[PDB]
Structures are given as C-alpha cells and as structure tokens.
C-alpha cells in the first residue's frame, strides 16, 4: 500500500477542470433561484399584510382574511406536492442526502418547479419553516440538471455537482458561505464510506450562488445582534449547564417531531384531498397568529435580535417557546414544503434567553448579558437534534459576528451533543431517511 | 486613559448634586463603570455599577433614590446624583472603570476623585499670601519660601509652584479648619541663585469657587 | 455583607525586611484583588486574582491565600512602597473593601530644618498676623514646636500640621502657625519658634524682631 | 446495501464514552504542554535581549553574542533531534499525516522530549519557524502516549485520540479551536479512504486544549489588526487577481523548499556533526538578524499588525519579502525542529499589503485600504501551498475578527488553490510524507 | 436623525484664508470618509476632497497643492475644510456630505444645509430700509399691494417678515441685486383693502452681518 | 474630467404626466446616481446606481441608461416634483456632477398685477430717489418692462429681479427699481411702468404723477 499512497499523495487534489466549470454553473443558478424564492417569500409577505388594510376595521373579517388568505396559499403548496412531487414535502434535505449515498432518485424536472412554487405557498402564507428546507433540495436538483443537460458522468460528477448545489442552497438560505461547505462535509457527505466530493468544486458553487444573493441583498443582515460582551473563564460552566438542557430536549423533540409526522397521517391516511384541507387549516392557523401573536409563527428571525437584547419579559419567553414548539411540529411534520433548520434556531435563542435571564439574578457578580446564552444557545438544538454543532456553531458565528463567545458556543454545543447521545437520541435528518429508506423497502 | 470626575463640592444637608465623569482614551462603551467613595481619613466603599447598555444598574443597599448611577456613551460620561444628601455623604468620590481576569471583577483604573462636603457654610475663595524671608538673607546654599492660604471653604485647594516646573523640594501641607474656614501652607526650597534671581511664584486653585490665584513671592526691602 | 480584616491597621519596617499583611474574610472568598495608594493619590490596582500583578508593579510585590486567609507581601521593603493598602473581593456580591494596612518606613534619624515667616504685608492690610514656623524633612515623627514671644511662651493660636511619610525620603515635614490680629501683633517685637527633636539635645530655634 | 444503511444511520455517532473522557485527557495535556513550549521559548527569547544590553558598549561583541547565543541554542535543537529523534525535524505535521495513515510510527517516548526541547532551541534562538509544527506533532504523539499508557484499542481508539491530539495542538498554538477542528478534517485525516475519526471527540480536546491556554494568556491577542472597512462588491475582480498571483507563487515556494531540503543536505551530507554544526550557522544568522532588522527573522507574527496598517513602506515591504523566503527556507528545509505553516502567514499578509497599496492608488473610486488585501493575502500562501483552503480562512478569520471580509478572503484562496492545481503543484505537507516514504523504500 | 451642520463661512478678503467646520450627529462619525463638495452661485456642483476615517489617505480635485487642506478630528466629531489664498472663484455655498456606496461607485450619502463663503474687498455695511406705499391717489381695489425696499447693504443674506411673520401668504421677497459693492432687494406682500390701512402692516428686517434689525410701519402716502 | 451633461438645463411640465431628463459622458460611464435639490434645501440622494430609489422616493421616479447615457423619468409628474436634478458618476476618477436641469410647474397663463410705488420721504431726505414696480403672479415669466419718464422712455437706473416659481401659486414675480438722484427726481412728474407680457398685445401701464 505504501506504493499506493505515495502515488495517491503525489497526485492529490486535481479535480478535473470540467467539474469546476460546470460548479461555477449550478452555484449561478442556485443562488438566483434562492433569491427568486426569496423575493417571492417577501411579495406574499405584504401582498398579505396590505390585504390586511382594507380590512383593518371589522376585526372578525380581518381574522378571516388572515386565515383563508394564508390557507389558500398553504393548500396551493400541499397539492403542488401530493399531486407531482410527493418527495419535495417536508424538509428535502434527508431527500438530497439520500441522493447522494445513491439510495434516492433526484426528479429535478418535477421537484424543481414543485417546491418552488410549493414553498411560495408554504412560506409565504407565514408558516413556520425555513428557506433551507427548499433551497438545498432545490439546489440539490439544479446539481443533477446541470449533471444530465451536459451529460457529464463518472461517480463524483453525479456526487460534487449534486453537493455544491446543496451547498450553494444552504449558503444562499443564511448567506453563510463557510456553514454551507462545512454542511456538506459533516453532516451531508456519505458518512459510512469514501466518496469523491471535491471540495473545491463545492467552494466554486457557494462563492457563485452567495455573490447572487450579495447582489440582491446587500446593506441589510438577516440577523442583527450588535456586539455582545465577552465571556469570563469563571462563567463558561454555566454554558455547559445550558448544553446539558438542550441534550436532554435535543432527543425528546426528535420523537415529537417523529411521531407527529405519524399522527398527522392517521387524520388524512394518506390521499390528497383531506390532507391539502388540513394543510389549509393549519395553513390559516399560523395565518392568523401571524398578527394576533406573530411570535408564535412565522420562520421566527424577527424574534431573534428582540429576544438576544433580554426585551422580552420571562412570562413570554415560555409561552413563546411552549407555542413555538407546537407551531414547529405541526407544520413541518404536516409535510409542507419547507425546513426545520431555521424554526429550530429560534427555539434555541428563546431557550438560552431564559436561562440567560435566570443566571443574571442568580449570579450578579458575574456581570452576565442574557444574549450572550441566547447566541449559544441559538445553535444548540441544531446539536442536539440534528447532531451537526460545528455547522451550527459556524453558522450562528456568519449570521451574528460575535467572535468573542466561540467558546461558550462551543461548550454548550457540545454538551448539547453530549447528552443527547447518552440519552438515547438519533440525528433528526439521518432517523427521518431511515424511516424513509425503511417502509420502501419492507412494505413495499 | 484618564477619568476625570467633577461637580463635587458644597450641599445643604436634605439637598442634592449631580457628579459627572468624563472618560477618555478607551472606548467607553462596552465598559462597565461604578463609583466609589472615601470618607476623610477611612477606606473605600462602593457606591454602585452601571453596564454599557444601562440595561443593569447595581447600587449599595441605600434607600428610595438616594443614588442614581447613569452614563451617556454619546460623550463618554458617567453620572452620580445622591438625594437626601447627610454628612455621611461626605466622601471623595472616584469613578472607575470595571474590568477581570479569571472573572472576578476588579477596580481597573481610577479617576482623580471629587470632594462633596455636606455643610450649611458658604464658599469662600482662598486669600493667598507670600511668605519670603524676612530681611536678613542669611544666604545658604538653598533658601526656602512659601505663601499662606488662608480662609477657604470646601476643601480641596491645590498648590503648585511654577505650574509644576518647580517639582522638588515642595512640602503641601494638611488643611486644618477653624470657624469653618481651611487654611494651609506650601513650603519651596530652591538655591540660593534661583532666587529673587529668578522668580518663584506660587499657583493656588480653588475649584468650588472657580478661582484660581498665582502669587509671586518677591524679596522685602 | 463579606467583610475583610487587614492585619495590622498600621505597621512599620526597615527597607530590606520581609513585609507581610493579610486580609481575612468573614465567610470564604477567592481571587482577591489588592490597591496601592500613596498619599494624596488615588487607589491603583497593585495585585489581582490573589496571585497576579499589574503591569509595572516591581516583582518584589506577590499576594497568595485561599478560603478566608489572603496575603500580601514584599520581599525586601523599599521606601517607595509607603502607602496604604486595601485588599478587595468580588468573588460574593455585592464587592467589599477591606480597611486597609497602612505602611510606615523606618529610618535613619532626620534633624529638622526650621524657616520663620513674618506676617505679609498684605495679609497686614485685612487686620491679620500670621507667623508661620516651617520645619521640613526630619524623622522621626515625634517633634514639639515652641513660640515665644518677648522671650515669653504662647500656647494660644498656634496651629500645627504634619506632612505623611514621604515617599522618596521617608523623612516627615511640619507648620506651625501662629495666629494674630493686627493688633496683638503690634504691641510685641521678638517672634520665636522653638524646634525640640530627638536628633540634637538643644532646640533649633530661628526668630525675627519686628523692628 | 439499503440493508446495511438503514441502521448504520440508526447508529450515527455513538462514540463509545472511554474515547472521548479520555479525548478530555489528552486536550488537557496537550494544553498544558503547549503553554509550557510557548512560555519557554518567550523566556529564551528575552534571555537573549537581556544578554544585549549588558553588551550594548561594544557593538562588534553585541553581533557576536547575538549570532553565537542563538547559535548554540539552535546547535542544541539540532543535535537533540538528528541524536534521539530524526521524525521530529522540521514540520511534524507530514509524520502525524503518516500515523494516522498507519505508515509512520509515533515515538512519543523519543519525539516529545526532543521536539519540545529542541524546538525550545530553534524557536528561543530566533528562528524564522512556527510553534504549530512542534505542538501539532507533540500533541499527537501526547495522544498515543495515553493510548499506549491506558492501552485503549481500536482502529478509531486510535485514529480519534492521535487526531484529537493534533487539533488540539493547532489550535493552542494559535487560539483557533475552530481551526484546529477543521485542520484535522480538511487536511490531516487519511484522504483516500474512510476513516472512523470520531469528530466530537476531537472537539472535546480542543475545548479544553483551548481552555487551558487561556488560563494562562487571557487578555492578550496574538495579532490585534482592528475592524478594517468592508469590501464593496465591485471591489471583488481585485481578490481574485491576488488569489492568481499566490497560485502561481505557491507551486515556486513549494519547489524551492523541497529543492532546499536537497542542497542543504549535500553541505552535511548526513553527519550528525557537520549538520548540527551548519544549524548553528543558520541559528547564528537569525539571532543576528534578530537585532539587524526584525523583521527578517523571528516567527513573523509582530509584523502583521504592521503590515496591515500599512505603516511600512512598499519599498521595505519588497526587502521583508524576499528576505523572509530567504530565511524561511534556510531554517524550514534544514531540518530544525518547527513549522512552516505560520511564517507563511507572515508571507501572505506582507505581499498582500503591497497588491494592496499598488491596488489603492489605481483605483481612487475604490477608497480601498491595503490592510483587507493584507487579511486576504494572509492565508492564501497556505491555500495555495498547503492547499487547505478551508483551515487557513476560518484560521484567520479565528484571529483578525474582520467576517466582513470573508466573501474576499475566500475569493483569493480559491484563486490560490485553483492556479496552484493548474500550473502543477501539490499540497506540500503530502508532497513530504510522499518523499519521506519513498526513500523508506529505495533503501532495498 | 442623521445631521450635517456646516459653519465657518461668510465674509473674508481676496487673499486671505478660512477654516469651515461642519459638525455631525446622530451616527458613528469615524467609519464613513466625509467630503466637500461646493456650488458657485447660480452654477453646477463641485467636488472639493474626501478623507477617510483614520486620516491616511486624503484625495483632492485637481487644484494646486495646499490651497484645500482637508482634515478630521473623529474625536470631537466635525470635519474641516481651510482654504487658502482665496480669490473670488471660490465664492460658493460650500456642503460637508457622507459618503457610502451601493454595489461600490460611491456616491455623495447625505448632505448638510451648507456655508456660504464671500470673496470681496467690499466693506460690511448695514442696509437702510425704505416703506413702498401706493401713491398719492391710489387705485384702492381689492387687494393692496405693499412693500419695503432694502437698499445698499453688504455681504448677502438679509431675511425680511411682514407683522414678524403673520402675514406669510401674499409675500414675495425678490433676490438680492448688486451694484457698485452693495446690495438692494425689495418685498412685496399683497393684503385685501380691508386689512390696511386699517391694521398695521409691517416689515422686519434683519442684516446680521452689521448686527442690523429693524422694523418699518407702512403708512399711507400724503 | 469626465463631463456629463444633462439634457434640458431648463424646462416644464404639467403634473400627472411623463417626464424625462437626459445625463450623458464625455467617456463612458457606470452606475449613476441622481440627487434631487429643492432651493432652500440640501441636496438629497434620489436614485443611486443607475435605477435603485433610496428610502422614501416615491415609485414614479425611475432611473436607467447604458454606458454613455442615462435617464430619470416621473411617470405621471407631481407638483412637490418641482425641483433641480443632478446626475453625478464616481465610475471614474475624479467624480463629477451634471449642470442639472431645473424642472418646474407647467399652468395656465396668467397676467401681472402691476403697481408702482413712488419714492419714500424717508429716501429723498437722504438724497436718492427709487421707483419701485412690482408685477405679480403670472405665467410664464417671458416679461419685458418699460419706464417713462413724462411720457419719454428711459433706460439706465433700471435693475430688475425674478422670483423663482411660487409654492402654492405656481406664478412668478418680477420687481423693477428705477434709481436717480432726489434731483432728476424732481425735474419730472410723470412716472410710467409698462408690463409686455403676452398675454395680451397692449401693455398693462400703472402711473402716477407728483404734480
Ligand atoms: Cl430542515
Ligand atoms: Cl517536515
Ligand atoms: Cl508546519
């Protein structure tokens, strides 16, 4: 073997320029369909919100404008998905990943228009789900288009082109460039063997498809925190504190969010009239406490910079939270198109916030900041449920700049992904393709 | 990096000042500051802290409104009003800045400090007096002068000597009150060529009046 | 409220001897800070975190202790080290101070230098008379000024001051002021200031004659 | 294999508990160890400085006692690796690429007494060389020393605890936790078959690696730069001409130290006494140039707040340059003990200050500052002669605290590590090990 | 708000020299490059020079070496602008401006009100305020149209309100005409015949730069 | 320099209709920026490279061009649009603005409102003598005047002054001092003010006479 390595490491990272190339082409197109997505959220967003103006007075009729406005648009993005793309609900990450172990097939001719157009509905009705979700499922298939419009073919072909679309998508989502090559490496590669994923054609894509989204959306963050304080050596066993807390939450909301996916089914049983009807009504739902408490709804990055800066009271902290947990099972689980990723990282800075709050009164000659444990907790449940904290922990650090706290990010990242392995908890996207790869091949 | 405190001085027993702070030289943001004070001739004792958001503010178990700490980080100052003012009041007050190490906070810089004298006397400027040899310059190598402040109220003056040119060989000595007045005395030692060869005047200020008097000592003839 | 007790409130020592003072805690503290400040000078962070000094403090400085005992020592005094010292905590809020251990230098004996002032003639012009006695850098502390006037012996209106220990010499300075109207001024001539200190068995002495 | 798949993600990351506590263990040590390497080398340096004052009379003698007490210090580390320990010259980054390949043994008993101790010399001396080379190859073999010393077992026991260990060592020798992490999973870890590292073990040592080095050095940065202005996206074309121009240098460098590994070999031929008196030479030259003109010599990282500031001229920025590839390579390609990875960081930001201020003064429209072609240039030299893109941004980015810059820092290493591939070069640590197991072999 | 206040401008001698401050509020003064930029009467704008946050690179128009001298102190939050050897050119309201950038071409963020400088030998002098009533036998229509005229003064502004501002509509305030190194401009305000003569109408007149204020009633002629 | 010139340096236009005005480059250009200037008022950032409004511009404005020349339009013109628009390019360096063009209210015509007013005593004791002839409120502001003294014109004395566009009105305003001395003053009686606007062919002619 000696012989072999000292050839392999001769002839190490060489990737053939065509694959280059045609990285540079899917991350263009990602990132302009991400934008596109984007903009398409926001136009609904308002084209929603002025309708709430001529409406504004008979405050029964505006609560029914909210929910049927916002059902319709979540009923228009259930059917786009139970009728030609039933693998473009939910998520769509576990779908990409699938691909990329060679267990899935990527129907980019039905997928792309699909969850497009479906996610439109979903996200721009105000449910609570993220961009992820469909833009690196999206991005994903653009990866495979590109892949079969050139023919171009070999196994990393099919494997890079695939990844840095999925890259692309992730980076394009957060406008994180380094959490989406750190996505694909920890947690979206083949995780049981060798593959050839070049991960310098990945680097290509996620410049090309966030450079897209710099274009569109410069001079305004998705997150803006300003700049936290320091964290005292004295004051990091408290983060490991909070890490333990969402170790022990991390597995027990992965069986929610499981079972959920099952209880849901039994309402409609699987055909797609009663379940686009019940998409609708938990589409107008989040519709409605869109303004009767828009906290409690939406992908919940406005709550964010409110929550870090301790301007919300202890009393709304928990209900926040109690009603966010519900909001996110009930409609990720429902099998809209879009993501839990971004849901989940509200979750953890209204969770690190009260316990921030309770360790500045507990602990006065600390001198601690709330936000300082909203900002570490903020990636947490990301640890904890889908097991991927140096993603989660890189990502949070690209969207709120607060170098400073790295290690208390990491400490409660960590014991986050402690506990919910000792606990007997499973990463969410990898137990979801299971159960996927599970019923297709036993019962078929 | 300097903190310089002000507004100290006189209040009538039951009234009420407001001191300022002005820092410089560090970004004042992003610190936490706190008073501390000293009574004549005892040790220090904290007041309370404000963080650079004035979202926390801590103070010594005192009363209602007895201080109120708070910061504009638009000019870098910090402020301390104390309400319902008694003689226990009378201290000199330093603002600091906060800072650790492992974590245990400490006392990073120091300002200079301002007096506060709850008292029901009035302010008088200092009257200044040259004090030189009498005539009989029994020359030595050196020759010693200084100039009286007499019948000032509150403390603190301060004595230079050539604006500080003449730093060696100046005593300032400890005022000490009588009906309800300070006095004190600066001594200078300088050679006997220096002087009246060259002149030698004394600076004195008095803060709480605003006043300030330069004197300089010539020989009697 | 943890309240600290420092040694001795006041202690003395010879430049070249090893000082110790300790500061003692009602209930367990950790990582104690501790301030210099000199005379007329505002406190300025000395040792902190127990065991750490402040940049530009000499390394003759050190601090030690845990639980309820903490300590600060200098390994061979010098003389500028004359200063009080307080010994802080913030381990338990809220933050406590200490009384503070205040340094005196020993010394070689110092005679003093005793200078005699007549009243200004300005100060004359208001209707006062202020005969001002200075006697400068001597050591030890303990010193007696006596006024005489016609060759008699005052003891009302005069006002005595000490300086602190320096803290370049360690020597002591004093004024003594003898205080006058205008009046009581004129119906006398000879002004004496008598200085006693341990340095010399007969008194230094230094006067002038109104005429 | 869905069969196979379905429960090997059912079982996703279960790290058996007695590899990461004792992950714990060696952080710890490596910690420790790499505080104790950097205070050691501080004291020796300043040994030196206080040597010169008490010769600062005699100007002729203050050269003399500069060039031999550096001398003998560098003959001391010489002697004590080509004597006890031949593995543990130069880098040590390639020996611990071949460990965890399972092609080079780890010595712990022979290397960390020698690497420690003889870096001491090299580096207290003056040395133009990195700590990271020493602390990455004593924190590996720290981490089979408690492999061996609780004789854990297992390919991944293995793997894990000797890859944790070299994290942790990067990562204490430039405070960069997220970069020691990503070193081991972009660059060190086998690379052309899987591998069973268990990535939150690696984070468990880095944490307290981490941990350990600032209880003995808070409040200190290694290099403070400031906040530098952002990068307008007009201003992009510019990174990636700066990226071309390290693509084609980093190939040219890779060669001329592999090409010095040779002519300096043939001065000494292989005698342990000609060598160790040839690294006295080499060590004398450094100690002399220490107090002639900083910054031809020494570690580098002083000047690079300098540089970025743009206070030196480019005239001087010309002599720094080539003077520090001089000095480079004769103290990296002789073999002393210590890294290259940080002088090239040295390299990068002063030619990137000089792209920089010839950038500044042809575009007045810009309103540039050279210091963001400084933090650009920083880890391109690593991108485009160590080629591992990833750990050198999110390394510097983990020490200048400027995110702002990201898009541009990742535009000019991929433009490095694009036109290193295509003008033939390879990644320098594996070019090593390949010579290093190749004459493992003509030997028969 | 984001707020630019120029100041330091107004009347000097050809040759002399000036110093304009202009004074920022209400954000982060340091990180942004301030520049000036003037407008000549009546004529185009002109960009002076900008300077960066930390003082290290300071860009001029092309203009002859130390006539502008641009500087900052980001401490107590103004920019500056001297210029030197004046002559007559350099007559113009002068703004202090922000700068930013979109995709990179940078463009002028956010202005101030502006300083106007003027680069005469002419002498201060006050104005002399004269009442314009119909004459004699007036054509008493509805409206009546008063006046005052303000004659011979120097530099520029006057400001002029009728009854100290009451009587906004119906006024026109012409501009000023110079000739032989004064000033004369004149204000018209249109009143229905019932107010005068019935009320008072008057005209305030304010030359600042002679430390001018006074009032002139408009009472009918004969 | 580059230069760039915008297109009509002067004109009108009635409000809920289209406008357009031109900026053109000596080279060619990149991404201009457009500022809109009320008098009174500082410049205001309007529409930065090429076609992006900031924050608070009213969607009629519009921006767009290529290379060498570029355009803002108003679809549907309003009334508070009546102000001076600059283009300005930072493409290269130096950057450099457009002459702008003023763009105002476009009305129905409007005849003046003459009247004249004779010298005051108060200016004739000082020895000077002003006639004073304001002409109100018309459109469009193309007016010519003509003094006559008893009957002959007179043409040296004579300085006028133009408004800018009224607010609320939209008219213009033209003042016409005739300036002599108190003596030629008095040498004549008649003092005539003719207003030729072209609203009519016969002038408006407003007198009066000293007797
Ligand atoms: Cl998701
Ligand atoms: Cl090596
Ligand atoms: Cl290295």
Request: aromatic share 10%.
């Amino acid at each position: 073997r000696r012989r072999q390595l000292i050839r392999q490491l001769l002839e190490r990272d060489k990737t053939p320029l065509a694959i280059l190339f045609m990285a540079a082409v899917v991350g263009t197109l990602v990132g302009l369909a991400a934008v596109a997505f984007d903009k398409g959220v926001a136009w609904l967003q308002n084209q929603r919100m002025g309708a709430l103006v001529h409406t504004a007075d008979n405050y029964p009729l505006l609560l029914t404008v909210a929910f049927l406005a916002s059902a319709v648009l979540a009923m228009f993005g259930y059917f786009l998905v139970r009728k030609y793309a039933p693998e473009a609900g939910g998520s769509g990450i576990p779908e990409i990943e699938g691909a990329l172990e060679d267990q899935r097939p990527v129907r980019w001719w039905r997928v792309l228009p699909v969850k497009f157009f479906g996610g439109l509905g979903t996200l721009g009705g105000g449910m609570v789900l993220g961009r992820e979700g469909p833009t690196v499922q999206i991005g994903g298939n653009i990866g495979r288009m590109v892949l079969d419009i050139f023919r171009l073919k070999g196994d990393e072909a099919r494997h890079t082109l695939l990844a840095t679309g999925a890259a692309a998508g992730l980076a394009a989502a957060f406008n994180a460039p380094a959490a989406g090559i750190l996505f694909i490496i920890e947690e979206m590669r083949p995780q049981f063997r060798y593959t050839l994923i070049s991960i310098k054609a990945v680097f290509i894509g996620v410049i090309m498809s966030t450079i897209m989204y710099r274009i569109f959306n410069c001079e305004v963050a998705l997150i803006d925190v300003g700049k936290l304080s320091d964290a005292p050596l004295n004051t990091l066993w408290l983060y490991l504190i909070l890490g333990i807390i969402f170790g022990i939450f991390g597995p027990i909301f992965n069986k929610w969010v499981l079972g959920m996916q099952d209880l849901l089914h039994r309402v409609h049983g699987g055909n797609i009239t009663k379940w686009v009807l019940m998409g609708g009504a938990i589409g107008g739902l989040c519709g409605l406490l869109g303004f009767v408490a828009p906290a409690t709804s939406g992908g919940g990055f406005n709550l964010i910079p409110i929550a870090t800066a301790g301007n919300f009271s202890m009393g709304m902290l928990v209900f926040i939270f109690v009603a966010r947990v519900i909001t996110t099972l009930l409609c990720f689980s429902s099998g809209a198109p879009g993501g839990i990723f971004a849901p989940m990282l509200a979750l953890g800075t209204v969770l690190g916030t009260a316990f921030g709050m309770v360790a500045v009164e507990l602990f006065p000659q600390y001198h601690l900041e709330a936000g300082t444990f909203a900002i570490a907790g903020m990636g947490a449940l990301l640890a904890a449920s889908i097991r991927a904290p140096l993603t989660g922990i890189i990502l949070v650090l690209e969207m709120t700049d607060n170098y400073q706290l790295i290690l208390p990010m990491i400490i409660t990242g960590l014991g986050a992904t402690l506990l919910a392995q000792f606990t007997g908890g499973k990463p969410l996207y990898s137990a979801i393709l299971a159960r996927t790869l599970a019923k297709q091949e036993a019962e078929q | 990096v300097r903190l310089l405190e002000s507004g100290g001085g006189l209040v009538q027993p039951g009234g009420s000042l407001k001191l300022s702070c002005a820092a410089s030289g560090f970004d004042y943001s992003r610190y936490w500051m706190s008073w501390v004070r000293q009574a004549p001739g005892k040790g220090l004792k904290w007041i309370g802290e404000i963080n650079p958001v004035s979202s926390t503010i801590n103070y010594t178990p005192s009363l209602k409104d007895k201080f109120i700490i708070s910061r504009d980080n638009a000019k870098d100052t910090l402020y301390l009003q104390i309400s319902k003012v008694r003689s226990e009041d009378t201290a000199l007050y330093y603002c600091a800045r906060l800072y650790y190490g492992y974590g245990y906070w400490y006392f990073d810089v120091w300002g200079a400090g301002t007096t506060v004298t709850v008292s029901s006397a009035k302010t008088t400027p200092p009257s200044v007096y040259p004090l030189a040899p009498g005539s009989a310059a029994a020359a030595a190598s050196m020759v010693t002068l200084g100039c009286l402040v007499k019948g000032y109220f509150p403390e603190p003056v301060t004595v230079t000597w050539n604006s500080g040119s003449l730093a060696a060989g100046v005593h300032t000595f400890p005022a000490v009150l009588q009906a309800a007045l300070y006095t004190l005395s600066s001594s200078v030692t300088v050679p006997s060529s220096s002087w009246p060869s060259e002149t030698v005047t004394c600076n004195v200020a008095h803060p709480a009046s605003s006043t300030k008097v330069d004197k300089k000592i010539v020989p009697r003839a | 409220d943890i309240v600290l007790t420092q040694s001795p409130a006041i202690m003395s020592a010879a430049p070249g001897d090893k000082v110790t003072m300790t500061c003692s805690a009602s209930s367990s503290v950790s990582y104690i800070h501790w301030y210099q400040q000199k005379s007329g000078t505002s406190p300025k962070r000395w040792i902190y975190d127990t065991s750490k000094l402040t940049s530009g403090v000499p390394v003759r400085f050190s601090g030690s202790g845990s639980g309820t005992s903490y300590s600060l020592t200098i390994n061979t005094m010098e003389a500028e080290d004359a200063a009080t010292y307080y010994c802080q905590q913030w381990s338990s809020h809220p933050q406590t101070f200490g009384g503070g251990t205040k340094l005196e230098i020993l010394r070689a004996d110092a005679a003093p230098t005793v200078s005699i002032f007549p009243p200004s003639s300005e100060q004359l012009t208001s209707g006062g008379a202020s005969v001002v006695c200075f006697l400068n850098n001597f050591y030890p502390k303990d010193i007696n000024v006596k006024w005489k006037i016609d060759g008699s012996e005052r003891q009302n209106g005069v006002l005595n001051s000490w300086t602190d220990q320096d803290s370049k010499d360690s020597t002591y300075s004093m004024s003594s002021t003898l205080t006058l109207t205008k009046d009581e001024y004129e119906r006398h001539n000879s002004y004496t200031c008598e200085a006693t200190h341990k340095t010399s068995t007969s008194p230094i002495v230094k006067s002038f004659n109104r005429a």
